């Protein structure tokens, strides 16, 4: 029984970063070397674990988080980062144990005149905690007067569309991201490498 990474990495549609998708992986064998050595990924960075040592370790659960962001935001998907993405959309903990994989998806996620399907949270009063997913669409109150669900002066729609156009500069193009998190609790290890 191989791990279903194909349905995570090769999904036709990816989530918006504010509503990031989480896939729980368990009771399967995973060959992480076919991923680490693949030419299709422009970013493959591991934290708390050696990438060339993944096939020899065992974990209780593996999480595969996936979403789309700009290319120049992929650097925020790492421990200790700040920015609109790290602070208000997807936050990794300082002690993160896992891998961050990314690749350019301008061919799938951009369209003539703009692709406004992909969104990110622009307004939030405070930073997210690690692995927090805020899907609120409540009107953001930027002044003392309540908004009453009405977008207007000092009452902003908290989410913004990226508006990916194929003509965008590479750092502003959409990138598909997959974050593999490895947890080891006081329970038997169900996810292992090919041994």
């Amino acid at each position: 029984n191989l791990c279903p990474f194909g349905e995570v990495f090769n999904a036709t549609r990816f989530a918006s970063v504010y509503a990031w998708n989480r896939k729980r992986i368990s009771n399967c064998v995973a060959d992480y070397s076919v991923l680490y050595n693949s030419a299709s990924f422009s970013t493959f960075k591991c934290y708390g674990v050696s990438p060339t040592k993944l096939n020899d370790l065992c974990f209780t659960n593996v999480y595969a988080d996936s979403f789309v962001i700009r290319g120049d935001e992929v650097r925020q998907i790492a421990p200790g980062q700040t920015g609109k993405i790290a602070d208000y959309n997807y936050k990794l903990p300082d002690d993160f144990t896992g891998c961050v994989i990314a690749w350019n998806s301008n061919n799938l996620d951009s369209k003539v005149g703009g692709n406004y399907n992909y969104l990110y949270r622009l307004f939030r009063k405070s930073n997210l905690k690690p692995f927090e997913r805020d899907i609120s669409t409540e009107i953001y109150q930027a002044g003392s007067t309540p908004c009453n669900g009405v977008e207007g002066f000092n009452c902003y729609f908290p989410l913004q569309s990226y508006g990916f156009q194929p003509t965008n500069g590479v750092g502003y193009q959409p990138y598909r991201v997959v974050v593999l998190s490895f947890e080891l609790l006081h329970a038997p290890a169900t996810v292992c490498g090919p041994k």
Partner: antibody, heavy 120, light 108 residues
Framework: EVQLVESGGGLIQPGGSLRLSCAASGFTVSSNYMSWVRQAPGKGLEWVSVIYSGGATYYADSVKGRFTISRDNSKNTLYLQMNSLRAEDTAVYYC??????????????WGQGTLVTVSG | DIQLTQSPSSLSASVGDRVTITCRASQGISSYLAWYQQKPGKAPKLLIYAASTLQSGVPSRFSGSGSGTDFTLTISSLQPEDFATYYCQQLISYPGTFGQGTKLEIKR
């Protein structure tokens, strides 16, 4: 009615320090992206710094390591601490509501500006 | 980094004339652009954001167009009070570069 009022500008010798203040009314400083922008006499506009509601701060390469942006929630005021000032820092400094990166709204409200003259 | 080339540097036009100011970005920035109007001794005033959305209170003679690399600010019928320096600004990344500016004077 939105009001932004800068103060603290004036003459300062090269190598000196100054702290600018921007008292705001009509919106909550701690809930918004707040920026500082400067304009040297007879020149164009230059974004200097931003503070996010969550606390993140960003700076132009020309002021990095010398300037610090901050705010006081209870006073609804924005600050710019400027150290090791040079002649090329001479400008009208404006506080503005908004951000300049992934922020389509631009800078909608600006104060009147405070002139900083770096001279001996 | 993105370069913003605003043109022309200066413009002279009669009252009632149609005036166009252009801004070209070195890379595609979608609609992340604003236009500002600055009068003597005053702070810049936001006219248009998201490349074509008029800011509240701005007269209908001002309009913005473009997406990607080429952007235009048009005044369809120039009024004496429109004498000002106009600036474009990219809003896609730090440092939110402003264009060089266009000084618009009125022929009379």
């Amino acid at each position: 009615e939105v009001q932004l009022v800068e103060s603290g500008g004036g003459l300062i010798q090269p190598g000196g320090s100054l702290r600018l203040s921007c008292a705001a009314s009509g919106f909550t400083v701690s809930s918004n992206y707040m920026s500082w922008v400067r304009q040297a006499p007879g020149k164009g506009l230059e974004w200097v710094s931003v503070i996010y509601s969550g606390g993140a701060t960003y700076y132009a390469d020309s002021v990095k390591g010398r300037f610090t942006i901050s705010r006081d929630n209870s006073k609804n005021t924005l600050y710019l601490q400027m150290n090791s000032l040079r002649a090329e820092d001479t400008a009208v400094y404006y506080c503005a509501r908004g951000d300049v990166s992934g922020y389509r709204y631009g800078l909608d409200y600006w104060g009147q500006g405070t002139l900083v003259t770096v001279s001996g | 980094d993105i370069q913003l080339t605003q043109s022309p540097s200066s413009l002279s036009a009669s009252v009632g004339d149609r005036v166009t100011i252009t801004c070209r970005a070195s890379q595609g920035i979608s609609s992340y652009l604003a236009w500002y109007q600055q009068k003597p001794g005053k702070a810049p005033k936001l006219l248009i954001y998201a490349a074509s959305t008029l800011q509240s209170g701005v007269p209908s003679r001002f309009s913005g167009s473009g997406s990607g690399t080429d952007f235009t600010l048009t005044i369809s019928s120039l009024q004496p009070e429109d004498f000002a320096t106009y600036y474009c600004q990219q809003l896609i990344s730090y440092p939110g570069t402003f264009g060089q500016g266009t000084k618009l004077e009125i022929k009379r």
